[PDB]
Design an enzyme around this catalytic site. Structure first.
Site, PDB file in Angstrom:
ATOM      1  N   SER A   1     -10.807  -1.439   6.248  1.00 49.51           N
ATOM      2  CA  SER A   1     -10.052  -0.939   5.102  1.00 49.51           C
ATOM      3  C   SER A   1      -9.380  -2.043   4.282  1.00 49.51           C
ATOM      4  O   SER A   1      -8.791  -1.765   3.241  1.00 49.51           O
ATOM      5  CB  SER A   1      -9.000   0.075   5.561  1.00 49.51           C
ATOM      6  OG  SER A   1      -9.597   1.319   5.888  1.00 49.51           O
TER       7      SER A   1
ATOM      8  N   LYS B   1       0.833  -1.196   0.000  1.00 48.56           N
ATOM      9  CA  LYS B   1       0.000   0.000   0.000  1.00 48.56           C
ATOM     10  C   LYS B   1       0.874   1.255   0.000  1.00 48.56           C
ATOM     11  O   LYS B   1       2.023   1.217   0.445  1.00 48.56           O
ATOM     12  CB  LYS B   1      -0.939  -0.014   1.208  1.00 48.56           C
ATOM     13  CG  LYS B   1      -2.125   0.931   1.111  1.00 48.56           C
ATOM     14  CD  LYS B   1      -3.079   0.717   2.277  1.00 48.56           C
ATOM     15  CE  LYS B   1      -4.317   1.585   2.153  1.00 48.56           C
ATOM     16  NZ  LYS B   1      -5.287   1.337   3.256  1.00 48.56           N
TER      17      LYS B   1
ATOM     18  N   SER C   1      -9.906   1.310   2.637  1.00 48.50           N
ATOM     19  CA  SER C   1      -9.040   2.252   1.937  1.00 48.50           C
ATOM     20  C   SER C   1      -7.986   1.555   1.078  1.00 48.50           C
ATOM     21  O   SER C   1      -7.277   2.206   0.312  1.00 48.50           O
ATOM     22  CB  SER C   1      -8.355   3.182   2.939  1.00 48.50           C
ATOM     23  OG  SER C   1      -7.512   2.453   3.814  1.00 48.50           O
TER      24      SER C   1
END
Length: 505
Positions: free
Chosen positions: A220, A114, A196
């Protein structure tokens, strides 16, 4: 939240690293091996190179080619923020020392972390922000450092909801001021990507990478995994170190593995776990041993298991009625005892106030440790974004503004966290430990609040597609430090159903 649009920032950030290390490559061999690599598991990829029909350099070339043609061009999913310029140089070196240094399933396997995960000297860590778009961290994240100890290397970085979805209430999921809007490979614009960890879900969904790393404060990981039909795991709070990751709320922050297959997810999960003196939260696993989460994975892993349902088929809409019904069938068909319709109670379990206070402090403390970071406080970020609002904060920055001027004291914070953990842990154990249930299954991210605060593990598995074709996942809640049982349960449900279909790009 507003609607997602086809917005793409700084396209040459990804294309140029790809274009540079694809000058001395034959497009013929790429497209041929591409059809054999797509939708193939890690174990199958290792077999393709053992027989001499593939190599790590070729494997990396295919992914870079797909990112160039599908992520930043063509359908343009825009799920990749950064690309390792040394991805090929590292890949070739892993091919040379392959037969001599091979030991783990992760050897030579490209991994996409990420955008909020630190890498050294190579790829910027920005958490999806414009202000940190060019800041390259000093050290690797511990999970990245441990990844390269088993042969794996970082292929690139994935797009994400900016600040792990903590900027404004109107910002669409998958959007970042750094790269732009993430699109769902199963239906751009039509279907949201959730957040996310949108990009980390997309790279494995669209076969831009075999494995991916995501972070979760509250849903997320399991929500974008369910929304893009891939596997996502939230580990127990203490299982995986958060060191080298731009925080949001260290109370809830965690890093988990993401893949198309439960098997491949457990493979990545082997190198992420471990002990860390820097992260004091990982001292709750010190008296435990490292395990291989890929051995005890049987197709009869649901045989005898007592799974408590967190959804009701009858009360479900006509759109998800067929999918929810098949979930029960596949669980029963695998040989599991299902428990009625368990409705969890979300009482006294706070999430927002925990974030409002801790975000400002975690971020400021994070920047204080860094050497050459262009920002040393949340106050400077707010001032930075104001100077070019339309670009840097298209949907505003109300959330980080609220965290900066927060009136909440530390006493009010630590008291809320205390009461929240004891409530969620008791609520979960009421069914898991007390009533002897092995796991709890949910639809998408409807019941994540409790398991996230209590620190219980979560495993998302593709449950199918509704009448409109929108992906629906089944997220399993396991017992504390029970990732071993979760994967076994998840693997059995995965194989005895096979709902995941490769997206039409």
């Amino acid at each position: 939240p507003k609607e997602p649009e086809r917005i793409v920032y700084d396209k040459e950030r990804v294309l140029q690293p790809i274009h540079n290390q694809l000058k001395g490559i034959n497009i013929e061999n790429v497209k041929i091996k591409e059809k054999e690599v797509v939708n193939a598991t890690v174990d199958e990829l290792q077999k393709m190179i053992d027989d001499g029909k593939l190599s790590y350099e070729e494997l990396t070339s295919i992914y870079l080619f797909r990112i160039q043609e599908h992520d930043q061009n063509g359908i343009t999913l825009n799920s990749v923020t950064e690309i390792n310029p040394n991805a090929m140089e590292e890949a070739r070196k892993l091919d040379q020392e392959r037969s001599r240094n091979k030991k783990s399933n992760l050897y030579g396997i490209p991994v996409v972390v990420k955008d909020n995960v630190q890498t050294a000297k190579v790829m910027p860590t920005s958490a999806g922000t414009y202000v940190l778009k060019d800041w390259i961290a000093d050290q690797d994240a511990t999970i990245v450092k441990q990844l390269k100890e088993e042969g794996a290397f970082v292929l690139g970085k994935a797009n994400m909801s900016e600040w792990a979805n903590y900027l404004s209430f109107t910002m669409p999921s998958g959007y970042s001021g750094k790269k732009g809007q993430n699109l769902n490979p199963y239906g751009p614009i039509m279907f949201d990507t959730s957040g996310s960890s949108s990009g980390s879900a997309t790279v494995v969904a669209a076969d831009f990478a075999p494995l991916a790393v995501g972070t979760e404060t509250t849903g997320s990981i399991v929500a974008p995994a369910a929304q893009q039909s891939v596997v996502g795991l939230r580990p127990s709070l203490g299982r995986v170190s958060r060191t080298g990751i731009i925080p949001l709320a260290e109370t809830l922050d965690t890093a988990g593995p993401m893949a198309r297959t439960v098997k491949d997810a457990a493979t990545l999960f082997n190198a992420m776990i471990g002990y860390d003196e820097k992260d004091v939260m990982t001292e709750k696993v010190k008296d435990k041993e490292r395990i291989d989460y890929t051995k005890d994975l049987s197709i009869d892993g649901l045989k005898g298991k007592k799974i408590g349902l967190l959804f009701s088929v009858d009360q479900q809409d006509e759109n998800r009625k067929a999918v929810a019904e098949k979930i029960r069938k596949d669980l029963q068909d695998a040989g599991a005892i299902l428990t009625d319709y368990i409705q969890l109670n979300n009482g006294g379990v706070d999430n927002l106030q925990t974030l409002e206070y801790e975000f400002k402090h975690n971020v400021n403390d994070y920047f204080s440790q860094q050497k050459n970071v262009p920002v040393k406080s949340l106050k400077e970020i707010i001032a930075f974004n104001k100077r070019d609002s339309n670009r840097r904060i298209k949907y505003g920055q109300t959330l980080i503004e609220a965290s900066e001027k927060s009136t909440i004291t530390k006493d009010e914070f630590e008291k809320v966290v205390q009461t929240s953990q004891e409530n969620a842990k008791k609520e979960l154990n009421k069914y898991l430990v007390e009533k002897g249930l092995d796991a709890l299954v949910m639809i998408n991210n409807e019941e994540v609040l409790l398991s996230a605060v209590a620190g219980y593990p979560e495993l998302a598995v593709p449950a199918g597609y509704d009448n409109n074709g929108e992906p629906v996942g089944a997220v399993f809640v396991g017992k504390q430090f029970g990732e071993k049982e979760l994967f076994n349960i998840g693997y059995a449900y995965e194989q005895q159903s096979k709902n995941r279909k490769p997206p039409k790009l």
